[PDB]
């Protein structure tokens, strides 16, 4: 039947829209997780090198 095929089309269209929305969501999720992890790694070179340099400052002064 026509509406046999049309309800099959509706199920396929809702599944395809569902998975496209899920693709956009998963891409934004891996984007935000990678941005947070790289903000971590960018902050850690500051948080470690500043400690190392201040240690050499006070060691040289001592």
């Amino acid at each position: 039947s026509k509406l046999e095929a049309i309800l099959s089309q509706e199920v396929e269209a809702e599944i395809q829209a569902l998975l496209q929305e899920a693709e956009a969501k998963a891409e934004a999720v891996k984007r935000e997780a990678e941005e947070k992890a790289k903000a971590l790694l960018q902050a850690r070179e500051r948080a470690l090198e500043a400690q190392y340099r201040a240690a050499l400052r006070r060691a040289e002064s001592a």
Binding site: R57, R58, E60, S61, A62
Partner: protein
Amino acid sequence: PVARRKPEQFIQTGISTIDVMNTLVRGQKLPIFSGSGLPANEIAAQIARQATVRPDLSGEGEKEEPFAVVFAAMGITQRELSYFIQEFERTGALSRSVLFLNKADDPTIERILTPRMAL
């Protein structure tokens, strides 16, 4: 008074209120009026550890020779003394700073002598 000069060259101290609104200029007397539990000692140590003059704004460059601290302590109680000593030794200023320490248990007449033989 004929042989004085105008205290004229901008010290930035890092503290935003002192840098923007109540400027500390090199050659000035300005006391920190504090209360009884307020952190006066930490503000004094912060101005000790980061006060610099910026000559690029001034227009000269010409060097960066840093400050020499003279710390004249009259009757502090080994807690404030330990904070000042630990701060100056972590920043490394003790190779430029003389400390006339008169602790609290030491007798209460040589507090007259202390600021004169510091200045």
